[PDB]
Design a protein around this ligand. Sequence first.
Ligand SMILES: [Mg+2]
Ligand SMILES: [Mg+2]
Ligand SMILES: [Mg+2]
Ligand SMILES: [Mg+2]
Length: 64
Amino acid sequence: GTTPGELRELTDDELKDKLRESKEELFNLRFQMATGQLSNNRRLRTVRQEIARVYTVLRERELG
RNA sequence: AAGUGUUUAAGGGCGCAUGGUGGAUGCCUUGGCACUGGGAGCCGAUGAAGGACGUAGGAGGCUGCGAUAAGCCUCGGGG
Ligand SMILES: [Mg+2]
Ligand SMILES: [Mg+2]
Ligand SMILES: [Mg+2]
Ligand SMILES: [Mg+2]
């Protein structure tokens, strides 16, 4: 839900915070999907792609 | 009285009319076969060729991808 653009003003530690918050979110809605009370399915994909985006930006910061 | 003499179809044959089965024939094609002209002529410890297992909101196969998993970023195209 957040463009990779506005992830470049965030430092390493707060990018890491964003990433762990997102991983916790993903665990929660994975449980909700398993128990049957998640109707919105595209939420899983968006959060999974957000995690991938956060790693991508971190690696780009490391290398250049 | 003597004599003559049609009609049987359990079933079978042949001809026709009507169907079934079967998948030939005709007419085709998301497939191939033989070449022509170019390109590129190597990939691999910066882990190859090729695979295993996984991966989509729902079971499998083919495809794509690899725990960042039908995808992630940047630059162009286009709509
Ligand atoms: Mg008869
Ligand atoms: Mg050589
Ligand atoms: Mg597969
Ligand atoms: Mg573009």
